[PDB]
Every structure is written in C-alpha cells, then in structure tokens.
Amino acid sequence: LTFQKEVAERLAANTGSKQRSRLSVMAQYLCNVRHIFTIPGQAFVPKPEVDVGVVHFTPLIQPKIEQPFKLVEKVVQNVFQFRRKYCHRGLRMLFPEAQRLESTGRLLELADIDPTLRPRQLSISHFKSLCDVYRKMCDEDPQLFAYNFREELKR
RNA sequence: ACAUUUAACUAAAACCCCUACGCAUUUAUAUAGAGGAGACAAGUCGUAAAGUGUACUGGAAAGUGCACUU
Ligand SMILES: [Mg+2]
C-alpha cells in the first residue's frame, strides 16, 4: 500500500525512533512491515506538497501479542496519548479515578514494567505483558474495559 | 641471593650466583550480516493570503495547535 511518507515511516518505525507511535505497534505486533521506498511529490501529475511511501505488510505466523484486537488498541492508545511523558501517566487513564493509583501500581508490578519508560521506548513484549495483565484485570472487573475517562470528566 | 683462599729464599696461583611470558598487552587481516555516497539516470522515455519554526496526528495528496515575517 502507498501511504504518506510520514505515515509510512510511523508504520515502519523502530523502538526509540522519532516516528514510533500507535500505528507502529499496531501494525508490527501482527505483521512484518517494511517501508520499501519513497516517491517525491514532483512525480505526481498534480503535484502535492508531500512525499509518498510504499509499504509492504506480511501477516506474522505467530502474533507478538495474543490478545483481542480492541483490548490491544485500547492499551496502545492510552500508552501513546502522552507520547513524551512517562508511560505510567498514560496507563493510569485505563482505570477509574477511585482505583487509579492502586490499579496502575498493580498493573506495572505484575507486568514488570519500569514506570520511567517513555512510550517511544516500549517494545512489543512490554505491550504483551501489559495487555495480558489488563485482560486479567478486565476478567476480574467486567465494567473496566468500557471506561472512558473523558466521559467521567464530563460529569 | 652471595663471599678472601692459598702463597710469599725472585714471586705467583685461584675466581665463573639463581629468577617467564601469560585465558597478560598492542595493532592488523579474514569471515556471517547490516548500512551509506557517486553519476538528476540518456533516450528507439512520458507530457500542456502566502511563507518560517516547532508539537501531535489513526479518515494525513496534508490538517490542527502555538508563536513569528510581509
Ligand atoms: Mg486530525
């Protein structure tokens, strides 16, 4: 598929890279993604002001996180909402305010994750650990998975 | 570590120590694998309000947010 150059780099970004974001983890824990080459904007007949990147996806035999897609999407989006802050500041929004501090601590403890890691520094295996612990919590709290902190901020 | 013997009616003889250097140290070569630069590719190729920086971007051919310039 052809994407915009920035989107192609983000889909094909490594850990720590300036383009590491939600798309990187989401595409890379399910597919082997390679950004093959970029086409400049002058090569398109109505010339855009952007470049274009061509990216190849191959589904992985063994996905790097064996969890439901929507659970992984929630975990990744909450991790990457504050991309330049410590990871725990993003994870704490997954839980209600009342249990925010305690549950985040339980999560990081059971996941063996350093709280000081920035989102751009988290590998797919860290996300695997966090997602497995989060699914266990959601099994042990049926109303957790449907929590949206913005709605509880509306009230 | 190691030690002054003989000899001396002219004067001479004798002399000989034991201890490594290595999975240490310096540089270089060969090898798996990965990554860059060069030739604007030449054509019997095709055709006729704006700007700058920075931050996020998962409905990104660019957008929005902040600050600036004419
Ligand atoms: Mg947008």
Swiss-Prot record:
Protein name, as recorded: Dimethyladenosine transferase 1, mitochondrial
Induction conditions: By the nuclear respiratory factors NRF1 and NRF2/GABPB2 and PGC-1 coactivators.
Portion held of the full protein: 174 to 328 of 346
Misc remark: It has been proposed that variations in TFB1M may influence the clinical expression of aminoglycoside-induced deafness caused by the A1555G mutation in the mitochondrial 12S rRNA. However, this was later questioned as patients with the A1555G mutation had similar 12S rRNA methylation levels to controls.
Physiological role: Mitochondrial methyltransferase which uses S-adenosyl methionine to dimethylate two highly conserved adjacent adenosine residues (A1583 and A1584) within the loop of helix 45 at the 3-prime end of 12S rRNA, thereby regulating the assembly or stability of the small subunit of the mitochondrial ribosome. Also required for basal transcription of mitochondrial DNA, probably via its interaction with POLRMT and TFAM. Stimulates transcription independently of the methyltransferase activity.
Family: Belongs to the class I-like SAM-binding methyltransferase superfamily. rRNA adenine N(6)-methyltransferase family. KsgA subfamily.
Gene designation per UniProt: TFB1M
Annotated phenotype, changing residue 10 to E: Abolishes the interaction between 12S helix 45 and TFB1M
Tissue expression summary: Ubiquitously expressed.
Oligomer status and interactors: Interacts with mitochondrial RNA polymerase POLRMT. Interacts with TFAM. Bound to the maturing mtSSU until the late stages of assembly.
Outcome following mutation: residue 83 to E: Abolishes the interaction between 12S helix 45 and TFB1M
Disulphides: none
Location of the protein in the cell: Mitochondrion
